[model samples]
Target chain A: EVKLQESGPGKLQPSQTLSLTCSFSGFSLTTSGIGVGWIRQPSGKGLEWLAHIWWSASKYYNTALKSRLTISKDTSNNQVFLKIASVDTADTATYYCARAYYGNYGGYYFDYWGQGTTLTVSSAKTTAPSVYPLAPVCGDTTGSSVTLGCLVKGYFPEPVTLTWNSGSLSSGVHTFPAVLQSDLYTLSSSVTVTSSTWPSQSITCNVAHPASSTKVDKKIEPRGPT
Target chain B: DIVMTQSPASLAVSLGQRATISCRASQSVSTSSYSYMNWYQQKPGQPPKLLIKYASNLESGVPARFSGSGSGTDFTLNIHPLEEEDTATYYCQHSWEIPWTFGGGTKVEIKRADAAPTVSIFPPSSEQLTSGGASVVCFLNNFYPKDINVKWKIDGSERQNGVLNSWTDQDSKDSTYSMSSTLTLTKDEYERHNSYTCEATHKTSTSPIVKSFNRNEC
Candidate 1:
């Protein structure tokens, strides 16, 4: 029975750059002597060779953990995948995949594997807080009530979530989801106000406009920079 | 240069199930740019292992039913359910570079759920029929955009070459692109058609417009 499967997204986020996939079966990967390698495994230990491909001496190798390894193959869908770039934290592993037949050129060892799938490069940095409810600070305002979060340079699968209403001051507007860290998409929301009914009046941080709001403002002048 | 054609050339399965192969293309190849196109699986002497490249991008560990759609010319290489080390024999070349050009190989035996299809190609064309016993019938019908080659030159020489198991895919609709091959001559073998000559050669083999020359290069 010739089989091999490996999906992705178990966990990864150091510098970021780890995509995965390996879907194959039965053989015929060009004619099958079999030699598809992309081994990983840091959740437990050992096995960290990133590449070992062969296409008639068309060998490829990039281990050590990660610099930007990319092993590719698609022999008409026989499949093969692995791309780990800039993934720090010892390049956490846990990838026991297989499909071997590297006899001479693949002396690096690896007959066939596909049980490993333990990714972890998290230092816990899945944060998000970009508010712009009236930006114009100078220093102390005696009143610690600020809601400054504005994100607009976002386009490409970002939450772009928008839900705001200002009848009395604020009753709704809570959204989240969209933190892609490749081209830059971090728009998590958070902004509140307790005291500042009109302390000194003049507070604007409006990034809203469905039809028209005369608000795309960012003015917060109390006893500082006006 | 593009020329890939694989049929039932040879097959037999057990540990699992399905193992099909078909690839056809003589012209109309343009998925924007995939260098050209590639798919290999040579088991016998070695070499060839891209398992679908620039067409579907699976080359990581390879295994998930193995899939690859059709671009412009035409392509399909599906391998699902089938397993048992999945016997070999399958070739479809087109590096979009060199004079590369292959197809005319498919072998997969062992799993016989009962053995049917014996070959079936009727419809508007795209010929098809499967039985394997000298009953090997295949003809992706209509023809394709361009680039083609179907091998089987026995009487003239060259016999061993057939193995490409799995859903081995390749498809093309509108523009016209068909690919299918399934040659298994064990049914009281003796030889049919004198020996063999089910040939089909179109264009694209590294700009091969027809270069025979002499003195090595005339």
Candidate 2:
């Protein structure tokens, strides 16, 4: 039975380089007929292809992450290695190593996979986000409903929480993924509420991050009808 | 690089009927005489097993009923007289160039007497709460025919954001399938004492199977 196991650090400081190892048995890394590759899955997201290394030392990487990624192998130890430089919270994920069967004429598929190792990149430094309400986007005026948007930008280390009126929201609330912008992160969230409630009810966008001691609440109350 | 697209996202075929899954590549995946397209069968909680290589060549130990055809850009995987044990997801991949890609999997389920799934909701663990967010999971298990829809509702209103669903996965030891959906919430939201419901709709059931969780109960 072919077996592969991955070992790596559970956590890393942001901007630090990450190194991981995949040790294998029941197969030799030096054999030209097989290859090893890496795949990762962030929490609450789909799997992403990273890079692969063939027995001949040739490598292939996902163009999106090619710049910071490296794939190598140690034939003597029957192991493969992966490295990523300048890690950030976006790099937090469970990484898997799989063995690929390489055919004679450019055909291959992953037939074996490791259990995977989870990595979290934390930062010692923190940057508070700027949260502000944007002009309300009109939606279904006939139905007397309007959508309000809140933009959160310029945050460090990634994890942040947003809420509507300090309560759980569903069915008409959308929070987008945080996007990296030149060493910082940005995010946006919107919620739909009845037009009548816009002027009477105080709609608040609560922002919580490690950088701030207290949660930031951005409230928007319309003074007049749209 | 070639893009692989598979058709019939889910199929319900009677046992002993032929089941065909197709995968089309954006560009040719063939050389002078060899086609680099491959087929794989994946069962829940198990690694994918190569069924056909080089487009049409059967892998060792794969049953004769499982076969593949086509070349260049179009490929097909056929299971003649499909068996009950053949209920699983099939995927196509091409190794014609760098960044080999796999097709979106096609799930096949054998039609039989229908069974509704058992739906259950699990509250977020302590660790998840400590992280300042809660991830509530709704599990639907032992369903037949493999098609199920799960929805999250807060205070009687349907929710779409912060919800993630998994593909239906068949239990290898039985004929049933299982899947899960997660609803994410902030810690403050979880403490609001709101009513949360997980509504699961299966092909076999006319009414949705519902399970609910309330933070106040904890």
Candidate 3:
């Protein structure tokens, strides 16, 4: 009975933009990737994370919540959103939105959540950018069946370096602890390059943070193993 | 990439009768079914709902008494009579993985959830702290499904609880977790406050996350 429903917009005053949506069921964000977080519980005060999202291959958030917080996705409709900005009233918390499982490296924690929605950073404002810059989800390889996925959101810094270059393959952790999720993600590995000089080669999932967008790339098509 | 934090982050209780939230996950969220360390009750306007899921179940119409035990990642969310609609603020979320983090809330006051618990029963006995010395530290974050083995004893017998503790495996997107564990009682000047317990085991019972105080910092 894995259910998660948290629609959106109930009321906001401050800077406006108090969107929300976490509709899940049994779970299926294109092949399975349970990690996704965005919390807030500000009244007396406590519980304030406002960002976490992932899907394997790549996805992230929480740079102190970037500039206000903006997590997005729609893998067809598995859905995911949390936009924040301005909003005053000290930013009345209560803004959760969940789903976090699978963890490794530094093993995150957030099994399944979605029972939060309280926005009251009032002033009743709304100037422009309402939150909309999420359009990233693509996983498929031409033939040799390529699959090299990795995930990470919000940066920290400390032992986190991954590398995988073209063909035959012989890197170290093919898929050890491949993945973990608490902040909506953790670790993930995949290798399958049947045989090809370097057709559409390019399976990069780099994550070296201190912050500057570190680097997160991917491009497959070499079906070799089977 | 764990970086979870929550302290007095904010507090103000008074409800049916219970309010407590604290979560610090930098890593560790053992996995494998029977996983449900529950407790969640967000009132006032609405939307942070789930009363409790997995970590403690309770999501049917949720209301029994607002309970939730502790498992791998040490959990707790008790609200016995905090009505006023329950007031609001009381978070400590954990799905065991994902960046699923919370704990920075305690805005009840529904009349203190209902008052009563300065000390009814809870390993309590450091002198009950009248105004004793001061130095507090008790952190036992998420200890999941299996791999449950932690101990610490002061009055009974036993000591030492080392290994900042951290764990993980793989599952990407939704397998993200968090962890942390620190201990030290320090309350001598006639013993007034210094009770520590930070437990979390799997297979079944062994859930302890007690916190006693009387000092200079946390």
Candidate 4:
């Protein structure tokens, strides 16, 4: 019945220190004989284990982050604190706190995880885009073709790539220029395909931005008869 | 990976007696001035507690009866005048390098009588059954001395795939332990009227505690 929740600021500027809190209940930090650890997942990346603190207040850190990370606990308040000094755009991620259980064989594994707190470290030159899929639309009166659209929005520095799973199609494909909206860029692309093949085809829109190392894929599925 | 080896898998000592567990690393876990070994104690149903760090430094609030020594590749955790509550498992870990490793734990128990666990098998709920397949759970509760083994069988044949086991947990009120194992079956296998069995073995029982599930029982 242990519960853990994470809270922190949603955004921060580059070179700023990031502070987050993991509040917990149903157990005591001092006498529970458990360890609390922090893990993070960057956009388009796997989870990264950062650090942990045991009930005895002993702290352990990932060797790569040992110099920049600090983990501590407030036993009286049932909270654990994490701080990363001088964070950059690469550090922007969703941070989670979890309970680490030591098994009979000496290995440790996470048993309970907190809903993550997302942090966006702002930079002047780079901002990753968010991609969304729109339902396929039936085009033409005979319904011989269908159009699949993808929305790529909220990115900075303009340059981005939009591709499809069926390769770089030139005909019946349209990509609009990026438009500025509230300090961010937005763009949309659509591709027309044969309606008969659409049902059996697994079509995906791939969005690549220089701001992020990982590409975003949005699957477009048929809706209703389309 | 740095291999860690521990000796004396089980130890039986009376109250007020001394107990010790040894851990050996395949390579040196020390730098010029620091030994990156740590010791932890885990009681049934409780999370492991850190007792020592940096090879010998005691953690806060740990009892004075517990001590740690040695460096380089060898480490030892000592419990002098062991208290009744000190009966648990002890593990040693090294963080000197990447992929920090832990040794096989040493189970410390007081010479006393043990209690057998009660085994019960529960069929998957309607929601689970509707999701795709049957996820039958075998629950073991009210056991003494955490060491226990659980196995699964399908229609009398031993099963290894699709089996998930949970860690032992202790009830704070009674200090007894509980654990569970799950067997997942495809929708077809679950509807076949085949029998699924959960077999649990504990030190207290001469025979394994067993439970079975069959769709017809519903």
Candidate 5:
């Protein structure tokens, strides 16, 4: 019942600040009891815990980013913002905001994730491919068939591909071309299952961008009778 | 937040058969901390509706036939004599988590049969006031098929702070039921000659069956 998405500029110059926002729905911002945490990864690297912000506005940050990181929220708006100063090349990474688990404040983990937003830190204005497709909403269930779709928006320089998964079996996935929305591109893909499958079977719809097609793995578990 | 594991995933029951759906939370889901556990039913193309809250407390307007029970990690939603319309998806969610997660959901399908309830709101049997308050009772009886909505209103306005209590009778033959809901009006407020009404709405009924009585009407 929870979903999130991250949005940010594609590139920034050295010494320039970086800013990103994570938007969420399906749960109230003020009373969710759960908090949010920021995590990022440099290209071809492991994840780094940037910071955590509780629903009460209390925050905890990674020692390395403490001096430059500022995590704030507009609870009324259901959004969480992240600001990092004095950005350099090494600071360039795909940033994600995750739904923080409740109860174990000191000990926490991410239960849900927003598709990452890649931020490039470079002095030269050389353009590079930066794109990540947002996760799709899985719906449409009949006794024998189901449909899964991803509404790709706010992504750029994309040579996009959408793939479907059912354990280890091969299935047909129909990916559509990108179309223009008010301010971003809208791309969609759908996969239908026509055969019987056990309940709780995992069906994932993955959207890959041309830049690092396999880097962003968006998934959804299509569920119902089929 | 706690995790809820619901079983059966899907079930088919014969008409008039008892049905039960179960959920197990990863951790305790109890009240005292604000009743984090809740149950819901989602009919096809319809938004899910809350059926039970705080573990076992049935929400107002929900039929007595639908009930919830359990504490800590184990919970069950029980529906007696499953009706045709009871075919829907049931989900167990908890306030325990930030994102407000829910169990994968259980589906119930009716193997056969259908029906609705007959309702009547009885006038207050006595005019005597106690502790400056007057009590009135509404009776709903001989309904084939349960699931009826009963509410109290004062002078046509929804009474938010009124007291309501209900009971069910399925002991005799035909499996038909008789239930009652009572509403009490406070002392000082009883002097206003307010008209209190009990409205019972059924899915098969085109309009609500409403009955009202004035405080001064003995």
Candidate 6:
């Protein structure tokens, strides 16, 4: 019942960016020994393996695209993310997110595929610089309490506002001062509870940028163990 | 990447018979450095089990009957004397590349023999039912390849009432074998004007090898 679906732009321009999301279900993204692989086949061409990530967070990249490709995962939402930069017409192909069939000799192959998402590289490109917000989620839970935090690194613009929307609560929300980054300004906020409980087993970290209307919502489950 | 192609889509073998499966890689999967080929067996509803790795090395706990050979593209997985539980699908894989590849699987099944079993009812009795019933022993003699089938019937209907068991005689020097199966019947179970029958079938035979028995008759 394990399945994956690839979603990305239909067309990209030379020197532009390409971002893809592989939404999966019926299996955990954090499953031990499991890996997600990205493969592509151009029109009237053979398959080219792009990259793969094991459950231990070790990543392998294709030598050709190693510099431009970034592979990551969202364990809370069961999705694998791929981003490619500085692409040209030669990069046009139908990309697939596949499940790796591992071998005992330290190698693996794709036995299942996500139909594929075809993208063309051409002059027609999106003019806007697309930016997808990556929100943080709850990580660890104890029997009595939960930890909720949001960390934004290398993000654009400074002076971001933090909003806490706990359905119901008895503990006070604490905001720590943002720590400066090595080069640019980075932002983060956290609130630890002493009352052994939160409002309704859920919380949200809304980072609203004063410079722009775009904000990121980090859905936090303070309720149970993941 | 190594391309793997397998010969023979399906194979059938009798017990103690050899089942040969072949896999050919497009290029060399092994060099003087090392070999990256492996063999695996998969049954219905079961995951693939590694039988051989590194081209010719058998895995731990694997039976000696399974063997592998060949250093490069041409490889063979030989199951000498295929057992009853050895029926499954097999495939070869190459690990020389990051995106490993596998050969089209070969299906291995227990082959059916054409030789039918010869059955005989012992003591040819009628009306000799005793306490604990009469021991109706049926000797199924001289069947090739050793698949022992024994069935019992009351009148004409099929039933699992009597316990039946079989064994091959080692003293017989013939490669073809004999199996004796015994069934029990009680006096109360006997019909006023009824009879008992034993019907045994082998996979190779078109019909059942049958023998009818009455009480006190062999």
Candidate achieving the largest TM-score: 2
lDDT of 2 at B114: 76
Pull out the clashing pairs in model 2.
Answer: A171-B159
lDDT score at residue A125, model 3, on the 0-100 scale = 29
Predicted candidate 5 versus true structure: per-residue lDDT over A1-226, tens digit per residue: 6877788876777898898898899776676557876777565443466777887788877765689999998888888899999898898777877776553222233456676777777554322222222211122123464444334444443335555563343443334444433323445444445536422465555556544334444454322121
Model 5, residue B25: distance off in Å is 29
DockQ agreement of candidate 6 with the native complex: 0.02
Per-residue error (Å), model 3, residue B77: 9.8
Which candidate, 4 or 5, would have the higher lDDT against the true structure? 4
Cα lDDT tens digits, model 6, B1-218, are: 45778879878777789999999989887768557787877653234566888778787799999999887788899999887678777888776775555677787766544456655443212223322334455555556656766787767877675544534322122334455554545645553325566788887676888867544322
lDDT, candidate 4, B9-114, per-residue tens? 8887766788989999999988777777888776642345678877787877889999999988899999998877887878787766555556778888765446
lDDT of candidates 1 onward, in order: 0.45, 0.74, 0.44, 0.71, 0.60, 0.62
Residues B1-218, model 1: lDDT tens digits: 34565665766544445566666777755435442444555442223355766456566787877677667567767677766444555555454422334566565444422211111111110011122223232332223332355554445654445411112221111122334333434533423334343444554233212111011010
Complex DockQ, candidate 1: 0.01
Worst 10 residues of 1 chain B by lDDT: B120-129
How close is chain B to the truth by TM-score, in each candidate? 0.24, 0.63, 0.22, 0.57, 0.49, 0.53
Candidate 5 is scored at a TM of 0.33
RMSD of candidate 2 to true structure, Å = 14.3
Model 2 chain A poorest 10 in a row by lDDT: A134-143
Report, for all candidates in order, the number of backbone clashes. Answer: 114, 1, 126, 2, 1, 13
Q: Write the per-residue lDDT of candidate 2 for residues A155-216, one digit (tens) a residue.
A: 77556778888875554555555666566666666566776777467788898875454488
What would the TM-scores of all predictions be? Answer: 0.20, 0.57, 0.22, 0.39, 0.33, 0.35
Each candidate's DockQ: 0.01, 0.08, 0.08, 0.02, 0.01, 0.02
Q: Which ten residues in a row have the lowest lDDT in candidate 3 chain A?
A: A128-137
Cand. 1 Cα-lDDT: 0.45
lDDT of 2 by residue, B157-185 (tens): 99898776554445444566666566767
Task: Give the best candidate by lDDT.
Answer: 2
